[PDB]
């Protein structure tokens, strides 16, 4: 069928829950304090969402 | 820029644009013959981002939440109060601010 | 933390390259999964224990 | 040998078309820009079968 | 007091823009770019598809951010 | 120094950099800011 | 123990016997351990000059506060004494519960 | 139909060579194909067609 | 690092801190202005310009 | 009138865009070399990404 790794037809894009970046195994890279949550990047949240 | 490795430099990743490290004399050609043969397409115009000046080192959040500080209510109609604060080295776009 | 699957007994762990100034020394422990919060996780509902 | 687009249109009658109509063939086809392939126009009515 | 090395740089040069440019728009007289181009009682099944794929997506001419693809001619919808 | 401003006058240092500290690789940086205006850049364009 | 199943009172019922229920104390944490948010950049406390917001306080997720709380209290006092001002009270076991 | 001759065209994608503006000379050009039926065709249920 | 421990039923972790240096130094230049800045040598903090 | 107690979920779908974090001071396009990209901390160093 379909091949998204090559005709880039991707469709899985729906999961995702969360992204974390480090360097050196330190330092979370956006870690100036930028995003809501400046630890990790939150996709969506599950149930929680105050 | 002082950091720019000249292998870049080289493979056009910084540095002079297509318009001039090129010789003057294909670039007239290529403005002449736009029309017919192209060849914009195929010579590679570096873009870099400027450095400093720009964005804050120091700690500081994208996206602020202010609550309300005072709220009223009626049978009909209710009113919402909020001590919105911009501290110094800082400027709001009120485009982004939505209730 | 480093995780520990159930009825294991060997747990390697690593540190990618990096520098090591000042180092002071190590301390360890273990304690159980389901007594120990997410790090860093506003509301966790699963976190049943009290 | 001499057929284009999976159609019996001679390769040398296309390049021409294409030519006359669009300024493109010695750079390779594609598809022009809309605001060239007006409705009298060769592409858009060009219309092969099998 | 310059305020180039802000800007982007488009190689060895700034990437200056238009001092022309501040907004001005009312009522009438002011038009903007990107107008408003665009059980089945009817089994065709096959335009219809591509129609629906047609409406969602675009296509004029001032699109210029980047190319315009290869050989050349100037045209409308301005 | 104290120059009117525009109806409250404003002092004016150009060496009155405090926090000399930048974030390198190591260190991090908290909340801080002291506004001061330039003496040429500041004013001239204000 | 409950002889039967059968609901409703009758004679076999009479033999049941009963066991108090297993104690099971409540109450806050060590030191309110917990109950301020800490080392979550999420939800991060704030202290900063009201001229310039930008907050003074820069958590991490890699330090335990708690837990280095609880040593420092360790260290630079007794930790055996009761403080009922923040709950000090440090929790321990019955060493004949511990060790038979 | 189920069986089908055909007649294709088929371009050149890698990145250095697609709009590489060739001066004159003779020069050697050679690549290769895929005959394997799976990854040469795409079929609406993906069923594997070997 | 590679530790053995002897097995249990129920999923574990092993808390392994690694002693560094934390120090915060604290700043006033003038009246309502705080500025911090922070340090961890072994693991160094945030990157920046 | 008669209508149970109901429950909402959400959830939401992006095909065929993949996701981007772009190594940027201010997530934005101010040019095709990122200014992190050739900051000096990354200029003469070796940095492991977990």
Redesign the interface.
């Given at each position: 069928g379909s091949i998204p790794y090559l005709d880039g037809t991707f469709y899985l894009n729906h999961t995702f829950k969360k992204v974390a970046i480090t360097f050196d195994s330190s330092v979370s890279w956006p870690g100036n304090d930028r995003l809501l949550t400046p630890n990790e990047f939150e996709i969506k949240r599950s149930v929680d969402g105050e | 820029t002082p950091s720019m490795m000249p292998q870049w430099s080289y493979m056009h990743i910084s540095g002079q644009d297509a318009s001039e490290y090129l010789s003057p004399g294909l670039v007239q050609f290529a403005r002449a013959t736009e029309t017919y043969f192209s060849l914009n397409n195929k010579f590679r115009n570096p873009t870099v981002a400027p450095t400093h000046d720009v964005t804050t080192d120091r700690s500081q959040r994208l996206t602020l939440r202010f609550i309300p500080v005072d709220r009223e209510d009626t049978a009909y109609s209710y009113k919402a109060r909020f001590t919105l604060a911009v501290g110094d080295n800082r400027v709001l776009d009120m485009a982004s601010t939505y209730f | 933390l480093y995780p520990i699957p159930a009825n294991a007994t060997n747990v390697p762990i690593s540190i990618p390259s990096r520098n090591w100034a000042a180092f002071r020394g190590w301390a360890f422990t273990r304690l159980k999964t389901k007594e120990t919060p997410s790090l860093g996780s506003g509301y966790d509902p699963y976190y049943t224990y009290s | 040998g001499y057929n284009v687009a999976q159609c019996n249109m001679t390769k040398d009658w296309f390049l021409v078309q294409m030519l006359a109509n669009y300024n493109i063939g010695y750079q390779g086809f594609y598809i022009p820009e809309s605001y060239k392939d007006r409705m009298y126009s060769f592409f858009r009515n060009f219309q092969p079968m099998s | 007091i310059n305020f180039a090395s802000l800007a982007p740089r488009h190689g060895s040069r700034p990437f200056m823009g238009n001092w022309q440019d501040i907004g001005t728009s009312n009522m009438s007289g002011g038009a903007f770019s990107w107008g408003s181009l665009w059980k089945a009682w009817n089994s065709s099944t096959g335009q219809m598809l591509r129609d629906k794929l047609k409406e969602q997506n675009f296509q004029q001419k001032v699109v210029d951010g980047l190319a315009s693809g290869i050989s050349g001619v100037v045209d409308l919808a301005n | 120094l104290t120059i009117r401003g525009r109806g409250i006058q404003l002092n004016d240092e150009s060496v009155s950099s405090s926090l000399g500290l930048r974030p390198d690789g190591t260190f991090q940086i908290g909340g801080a800011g002291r506004p001061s205006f330039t003496p040429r850049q500041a004013i001239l364009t204000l | 123990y409950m002889p039967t199943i059968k609901e409703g009172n009758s004679r076999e019922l009479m033999g049941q016997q009963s066991m108090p229920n297993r104690p099971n104390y409540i109450a806050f944490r060590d030191n309110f351990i917990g109950l301020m948010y800490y080392n979550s950049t999420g939800n991060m406390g704030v202290l900063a000059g009201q001229a310039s917001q930008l907050n003074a306080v820069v958590d991490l997720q890699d330090r335990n506060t708690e837990l280095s709380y609880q040593l420092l209290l360790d260290s630079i006092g007794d930790r055996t004494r009761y403080f009922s001002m923040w709950n000090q009270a440090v929790d321990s076991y019955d060493p004949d519960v511990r060790i038979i | 139909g189920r069986y089908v001759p055909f007649h294709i065209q088929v371009p050149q994608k890698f990145f250095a060579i697609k709009n590489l503006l060739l001066l004159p000379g003779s020069y050697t050009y050679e690549w290769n194909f895929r005959k394997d039926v799976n990854m040469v065709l795409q079929s609406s249920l993906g069923n594997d067609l070997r | 690092?590679?530790?053995?421990?002897?097995?249990?039923?129920?999923?574990?972790?092993?808390?392994?801190?690694?002693?560094?240096?934390?120090v915060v130094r604290?700043?006033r230049?003038?009246r309502?202005?705080?500025?911090?800045?922070?340090?961890?040598?072994?693991?160094?903090?945030?990157?920046?310009? | 009138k008669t209508a149970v107690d109901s429950i909402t979920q959400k959830k939401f779908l992006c095909d065929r865009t993949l996701w981007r974090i772009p190594f940027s001071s201010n997530f934005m396009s101010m040019g095709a070399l990122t200014d992190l990209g050739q900051n000096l901390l990354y200029a003469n160093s070796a940095h492991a990404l977990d």
């Open positions: - | - | - | - | - | - | - | - | 690092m590679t530790f053995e421990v002897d097995p249990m039923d129920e999923p574990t972790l092993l808390y392994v801190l690694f002693e560094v240096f934390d604290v700043h230049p003038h309502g202005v705080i500025e911090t800045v922070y340090l961890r040598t072994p693991f160094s903090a945030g990157n920046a310009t | -």
